[PDB]
Amino acid sequence: GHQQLYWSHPRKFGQGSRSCRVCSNRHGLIRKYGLNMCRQCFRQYAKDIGFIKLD
């Protein structure tokens, strides 16, 4: 009866399925302004986001 039993428990607090939006990676997710990436993808892809370094 898995067809009506599929996805029984709503996992809403966890980010297993809400991990970094790029790939199958975790351990360092940041939700500043809703990035939903880890540090790796953000830093390598920060040139297209619009975040620049002049501090």
Partner: protein
């Protein structure tokens, strides 16, 4: 009321000012009483990220800062005239929010 408000926001100050000058000239090309561009405080967004992908070495961080500059142009005119002025090949990266009340 016919006070049309453009909440125009962009990442570049120079492109923003060129857009504002072109818009206020197009208003100045017609008979429209206008206010000067109102510069709301730019949003400075800070993201401080560790540089080494795996924790090793000296504690080193990048500080990515995002400067968001926003002007408002509220002119006493029907929005159709402002839209007639609008078709001027708006600068990329400058977004327009239309407020009519």
């Amino acid at each position: 009321i016919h006070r049309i408000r453009i909440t125009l926001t962009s990442r570049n100050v120079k492109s923003l000012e060129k857009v504002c000058a072109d818009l206020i000239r197009g208003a100045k090309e017609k008979n429209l009483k206008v206010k000067g561009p109102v510069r709301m405080p730019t949003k400075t967004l800070r993201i401080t990220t560790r540089k080494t992908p795996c924790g090793e070495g000296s504690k080193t961080w990048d500080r990515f800062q995002m400067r968001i500059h926003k002007r408002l142009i509220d002119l006493h005119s029907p929005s159709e005239i402002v839209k007639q002025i609008t078709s001027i090949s708006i600068e990329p990266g400058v977004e327009v929010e239309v407020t009519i009340a």
